Enzyme design. Structure first.
Site, PDB file in Angstrom:
ATOM      1  N   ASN A   1       0.835  -1.189   0.000  1.00 35.01           N
ATOM      2  CA  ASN A   1       0.000   0.000   0.000  1.00 35.01           C
ATOM      3  C   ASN A   1       0.874   1.243   0.000  1.00 35.01           C
ATOM      4  O   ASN A   1       1.950   1.273   0.602  1.00 35.01           O
ATOM      5  CB  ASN A   1      -0.933   0.036   1.219  1.00 35.01           C
ATOM      6  CG  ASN A   1      -0.250   0.586   2.459  1.00 35.01           C
ATOM      7  OD1 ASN A   1      -0.279   1.791   2.710  1.00 35.01           O
ATOM      8  ND2 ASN A   1       0.369  -0.293   3.239  1.00 35.01           N
TER       9      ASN A   1
ATOM     10  N   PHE B   1      -1.453   8.543   4.401  1.00 37.32           N
ATOM     11  CA  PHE B   1      -2.254   9.169   5.449  1.00 37.32           C
ATOM     12  C   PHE B   1      -3.460   9.908   4.853  1.00 37.32           C
ATOM     13  O   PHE B   1      -3.558  11.133   4.871  1.00 37.32           O
ATOM     14  CB  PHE B   1      -1.406  10.130   6.290  1.00 37.32           C
ATOM     15  CG  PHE B   1      -0.426   9.452   7.219  1.00 37.32           C
ATOM     16  CD1 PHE B   1      -0.562   8.116   7.568  1.00 37.32           C
ATOM     17  CD2 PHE B   1       0.631  10.169   7.751  1.00 37.32           C
ATOM     18  CE1 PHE B   1       0.346   7.511   8.423  1.00 37.32           C
ATOM     19  CE2 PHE B   1       1.539   9.570   8.605  1.00 37.32           C
ATOM     20  CZ  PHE B   1       1.397   8.243   8.941  1.00 37.32           C
TER      21      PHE B   1
ATOM     22  N   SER C   1       5.685   5.303   9.109  1.00 36.48           N
ATOM     23  CA  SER C   1       5.002   5.171   7.822  1.00 36.48           C
ATOM     24  C   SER C   1       5.991   5.405   6.689  1.00 36.48           C
ATOM     25  O   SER C   1       6.745   6.384   6.723  1.00 36.48           O
ATOM     26  CB  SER C   1       3.846   6.163   7.723  1.00 36.48           C
ATOM     27  OG  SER C   1       3.283   6.157   6.420  1.00 36.48           O
TER      28      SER C   1
ATOM     29  N   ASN D   1       5.104   6.066   3.540  1.00 35.55           N
ATOM     30  CA  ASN D   1       4.423   6.788   2.475  1.00 35.55           C
ATOM     31  C   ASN D   1       4.419   8.297   2.679  1.00 35.55           C
ATOM     32  O   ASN D   1       3.883   9.019   1.833  1.00 35.55           O
ATOM     33  CB  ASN D   1       2.986   6.273   2.342  1.00 35.55           C
ATOM     34  CG  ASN D   1       2.926   4.773   2.096  1.00 35.55           C
ATOM     35  OD1 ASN D   1       3.777   4.211   1.408  1.00 35.55           O
ATOM     36  ND2 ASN D   1       1.918   4.118   2.664  1.00 35.55           N
ATOM     37  N   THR D   2       4.998   8.788   3.772  1.00 29.69           N
ATOM     38  CA  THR D   2       5.245  10.216   3.950  1.00 29.69           C
ATOM     39  C   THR D   2       6.753  10.427   3.964  1.00 29.69           C
ATOM     40  O   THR D   2       7.420  10.003   4.924  1.00 29.69           O
ATOM     41  CB  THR D   2       4.620  10.734   5.246  1.00 29.69           C
ATOM     42  OG1 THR D   2       5.337  10.212   6.371  1.00 29.69           O
ATOM     43  CG2 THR D   2       3.158  10.315   5.342  1.00 29.69           C
TER      44      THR D   2
ATOM     45  N   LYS E   1       5.093   3.500  17.489  1.00 29.06           N
ATOM     46  CA  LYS E   1       5.116   2.482  16.448  1.00 29.06           C
ATOM     47  C   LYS E   1       6.389   2.648  15.629  1.00 29.06           C
ATOM     48  O   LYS E   1       6.661   3.734  15.104  1.00 29.06           O
ATOM     49  CB  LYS E   1       3.884   2.583  15.550  1.00 29.06           C
ATOM     50  CG  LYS E   1       3.727   1.409  14.599  1.00 29.06           C
ATOM     51  CD  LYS E   1       2.342   1.378  13.973  1.00 29.06           C
ATOM     52  CE  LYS E   1       2.156   0.135  13.117  1.00 29.06           C
ATOM     53  NZ  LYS E   1       0.779   0.039  12.556  1.00 29.06           N
TER      54      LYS E   1
ATOM     55  N   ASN F   1       5.469  -1.463  11.833  1.00 27.94           N
ATOM     56  CA  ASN F   1       4.769  -0.913  10.681  1.00 27.94           C
ATOM     57  C   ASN F   1       5.137  -1.736   9.446  1.00 27.94           C
ATOM     58  O   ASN F   1       5.781  -2.784   9.539  1.00 27.94           O
ATOM     59  CB  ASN F   1       5.106   0.566  10.520  1.00 27.94           C
ATOM     60  CG  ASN F   1       3.974   1.356   9.891  1.00 27.94           C
ATOM     61  OD1 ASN F   1       3.282   0.872   8.994  1.00 27.94           O
ATOM     62  ND2 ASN F   1       3.776   2.578  10.366  1.00 27.94           N
TER      63      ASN F   1
HETATM   64  C1  LIG Z   1      -3.674  -0.248   3.391  1.00 26.68           C
HETATM   65  C2  LIG Z   1      -2.893  -0.115   4.667  1.00 26.68           C
HETATM   66  C3  LIG Z   1      -2.981   1.067   5.382  1.00 26.68           C
HETATM   67  C4  LIG Z   1      -2.270   1.229   6.562  1.00 26.68           C
HETATM   68  N1  LIG Z   1      -2.371   2.416   7.252  1.00 26.68           N
HETATM   69  C5  LIG Z   1      -1.677   2.590   8.427  1.00 26.68           C
HETATM   70  C6  LIG Z   1      -1.788   3.785   9.127  1.00 26.68           C
HETATM   71  O1  LIG Z   1      -2.509   4.685   8.697  1.00 26.68           O
HETATM   72  N2  LIG Z   1      -1.088   3.959  10.303  1.00 26.68           N
HETATM   73  C7  LIG Z   1      -0.284   2.946  10.782  1.00 26.68           C
HETATM   74  O2  LIG Z   1       0.342   3.097  11.830  1.00 26.68           O
HETATM   75  N3  LIG Z   1      -0.179   1.759  10.090  1.00 26.68           N
HETATM   76  C8  LIG Z   1      -0.869   1.573   8.913  1.00 26.68           C
HETATM   77  N4  LIG Z   1      -0.757   0.385   8.220  1.00 26.68           N
HETATM   78  C9  LIG Z   1       0.125  -0.702   8.764  1.00 26.68           C
HETATM   79  C10 LIG Z   1      -0.729  -1.693   9.547  1.00 26.68           C
HETATM   80  O3  LIG Z   1      -1.386  -1.004  10.591  1.00 26.68           O
HETATM   81  C11 LIG Z   1       0.102  -2.827  10.132  1.00 26.68           C
HETATM   82  O4  LIG Z   1       1.087  -2.286  10.983  1.00 26.68           O
HETATM   83  C12 LIG Z   1       0.770  -3.648   9.041  1.00 26.68           C
HETATM   84  O5  LIG Z   1      -0.073  -3.729   7.910  1.00 26.68           O
HETATM   85  C13 LIG Z   1       1.081  -5.065   9.510  1.00 26.68           C
HETATM   86  O6  LIG Z   1      -0.131  -5.743   9.740  1.00 26.68           O
HETATM   87  P1  LIG Z   1      -0.384  -7.188   9.084  1.00 26.68           P
HETATM   88  O7  LIG Z   1       0.933  -7.860   8.799  1.00 26.68           O
HETATM   89  O8  LIG Z   1      -1.209  -8.044  10.020  1.00 26.68           O
HETATM   90  O9  LIG Z   1      -1.130  -6.982   7.791  1.00 26.68           O
HETATM   91  C14 LIG Z   1      -1.462   0.208   7.042  1.00 26.68           C
HETATM   92  C15 LIG Z   1      -1.373  -0.977   6.325  1.00 26.68           C
HETATM   93  C16 LIG Z   1      -2.079  -1.145   5.141  1.00 26.68           C
HETATM   94  C17 LIG Z   1      -1.950  -2.448   4.405  1.00 26.68           C
HETATM   95  O1  LIG Z   2       2.134   3.528   8.790  1.00 29.26           O
HETATM   96  C1  LIG Z   2       1.663   3.408   7.671  1.00 29.26           C
HETATM   97  C2  LIG Z   2       0.883   4.403   6.978  1.00 29.26           C
HETATM   98  C3  LIG Z   2       0.419   4.145   5.739  1.00 29.26           C
HETATM   99  C4  LIG Z   2      -0.415   5.130   4.909  1.00 29.26           C
HETATM  100  O2  LIG Z   2      -1.441   5.573   5.441  1.00 29.26           O
HETATM  101  O3  LIG Z   2       0.056   5.366   3.783  1.00 29.26           O
HETATM  102  N1  LIG Z   2       0.680   2.960   5.129  1.00 29.26           N
HETATM  103  C5  LIG Z   2       1.405   1.948   5.691  1.00 29.26           C
HETATM  104  O4  LIG Z   2       1.626   0.892   5.132  1.00 29.26           O
HETATM  105  N2  LIG Z   2       1.863   2.235   6.951  1.00 29.26           N
END
Ligand SMILES: Cc1cc2nc3c(=O)[nH]c(=O)nc-3n(C[C@H](O)[C@H](O)[C@H](O)COP(=O)(O)O)c2cc1C
Ligand SMILES: O=c1cc(C(O)O)[nH]c(=O)[nH]1
Ligand SMILES: Cc1cn(C2CC2)c(=O)c2nn(C)c(Cc3ccc(C(F)(F)F)cc3)c12
Length: 376
Positions: free
Chosen positions: A115, A119, A186, A188-189, A240, A269
């Site tokens: 992804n 944000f 993150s 993506n920033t 995190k 993350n």
């Molecule tokens: C589409 C998407 C959006 C995410 N957005 C955030 C986010 O806004 N803030 C954050 O701390 N982590 C974000 N994450 C990371 C997840 O919260 C998590 O830390 C990571 O996907 C690992 O989880 P998993 O292995 O069970 O999928 C995002 C992940 C995905 C796939």
């Molecule tokens: O911590 C984060 C944040 C994002 C996002 O919102 O772009 N995506 C991730 O995969 N991890």
């Protein structure tokens, strides 16, 4: 504890994972939960699975990771699926659109997701209004009693000096959060992970804890009425962290967490160092899911040792089965967050994972879940 309601969504799940775009799948899920037509899991949870992080008492050790309900428009339904807590966000003081779509891609064969959202959220103000509405509903609904809601916070894309954005979020939504998660990981920033430098991360952490502590000073009433959350107490502060750091960085940041007395660490993350997903070769962003499982667990061991087990760990990354959860817990984690699991397993994630962990806890020989933390 079967339920005819959970099963119907597994039918839809196979279709979506095969044809529908990921973010469209996310919108539908959130939309269905907005109208409270998702299944429930109202069964009593195993007392062996109850966990806590200091005075934060979780009814079971599974919540939903950040990035799922970024705007708090789906809290009630998601929690009622069987989760003990949810981490909303990440939020910024002003809502952003994020990067351009498509920005979410799925590799069903490898159970992986990549992804590049960036944000995308409604902003602190609007999300705060939503959370206030939820806390009001929570007061009147039994299925939401004692459930936890954490808030992941970040910076707007253009806003330099990330400290300022954090203080704004603290001062607008702090009273309604059970814990605060600082997202300095993150991918993506641009340059956010550059802020994990020991010095920068120190000032960030200390400013958050100070800003949280300052909301209490100038209060007119008791603490029972100021903190309109589950604990009725000031929110804990978690950080995190990203897994793509070297050992020197990893040890000093751990030293900073000890000096600053952070309340917890969320490991971890998404990662940018995976290059073995053929469908994600030309795709930008961080990858989540099964291919992140083993990498994050090691990081928890590496950190659970770097901090001398004095700072609790919150596990996130590639958790798909009950045994995966125990692998995280026996490595040093106290709680687990599920994200990709909900993507690939759907409505049955919590009920399935909680049953599997319950059976495995007694087989491995444990009185309760705590006995397992760091036993490896
Ligand atoms: C589409 C998407 C959006 C995410 N957005 C955030 C986010 O806004 N803030 C954050 O701390 N982590 C974000 N994450 C990371 C997840 O919260 C998590 O830390 C990571 O996907 C690992 O989880 P998993 O292995 O069970 O999928 C995002 C992940 C995905 C796939
Ligand atoms: O911590 C984060 C944040 C994002 C996002 O919102 O772009 N995506 C991730 O995969 N991890
Ligand atoms: C929850 C979820 C999120 N995301 C993206 C942000 C990463 C995905 O891509 C997903 N794909 N599936 C399949 C889901 C889960 C799901 C289950 C059932 C339905 C319904 F039955 F209603 F059709 C819809 C969706 C996803």
């Amino acid at each position: 504890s079967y339920n005819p309601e959970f099963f119907l969504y597994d039918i839809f799940l196979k279709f979506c994972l095969k044809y529908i775009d990921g973010e469209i799948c996310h919108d539908l899920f959130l939309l269905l939960g907005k109208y409270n037509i998702l299944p429930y899991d109202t069964s009593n949870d195993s007392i062996y699975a109850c966990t806590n992080i200091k005075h934060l008492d979780f009814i079971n050790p599974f919540g939903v990771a950040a990035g799922f309900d970024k705007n708090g428009v789906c809290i009630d339904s998601i929690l009622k699926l069987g989760f003990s807590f949810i981490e909303i966000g990440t939020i910024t003081p002003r809502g952003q659109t994020g990067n351009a779509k498509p920005r979410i891609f799925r590799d069903v064969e490898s159970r992986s997701i990549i992804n590049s959202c960036g944000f995308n959220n409604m902003g602190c103000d609007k999300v705060t209004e939503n959370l206030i509405l939820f806390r009001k509903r929570q007061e009147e609904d039994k299925l939401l009693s004692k459930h936890i809601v954490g808030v992941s916070i970040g910076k707007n894309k253009d806003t330099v000096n990330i400290v300022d954005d954090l203080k704004y979020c603290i001062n607008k939504i702090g009273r309604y959060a059970d814990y605060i998660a600082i997202n300095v990981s993150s991918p993506n920033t641009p340059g956010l992970r550059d802020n994990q430098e020991a010095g920068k991360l120190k000032n960030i952490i200390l400013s958050v804890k100070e800003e949280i502590d300052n909301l209490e000073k100038n209060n007119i009433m008791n603490d029972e009425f100021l903190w309109f959350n589950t604990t009725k107490k000031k929110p804990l502060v978690f950080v995190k962290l990203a897994p793509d750091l070297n050992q020197e960085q990893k040890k000093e940041i751990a030293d900073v967490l000890l000096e600053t007395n952070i309340d917890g660490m969320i490991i971890s993350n998404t990662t940018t160092q995976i290059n073995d997903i053929k469908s994600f070769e030309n795709k930008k962003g961080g990858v989540s899911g099964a291919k992140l499982k083993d990498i994050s667990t090691k990081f928890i061991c590496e950190m659970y040792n770097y901090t001398n087990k004095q700072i609790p760990i919150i596990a996130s990354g590639g958790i798909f089965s009950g045994l995966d959860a125990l692998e995280k817990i026996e490595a040093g984690a106290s709680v687990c967050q599920l994200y990709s699991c909900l993507v690939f397993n759907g409505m049955k994630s919590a009920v399935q994972i909680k049953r599997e962990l319950n059976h495995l806890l007694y087989q491995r020989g444990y009185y309760n879940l705590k006995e397992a933390i760091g036993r490896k």
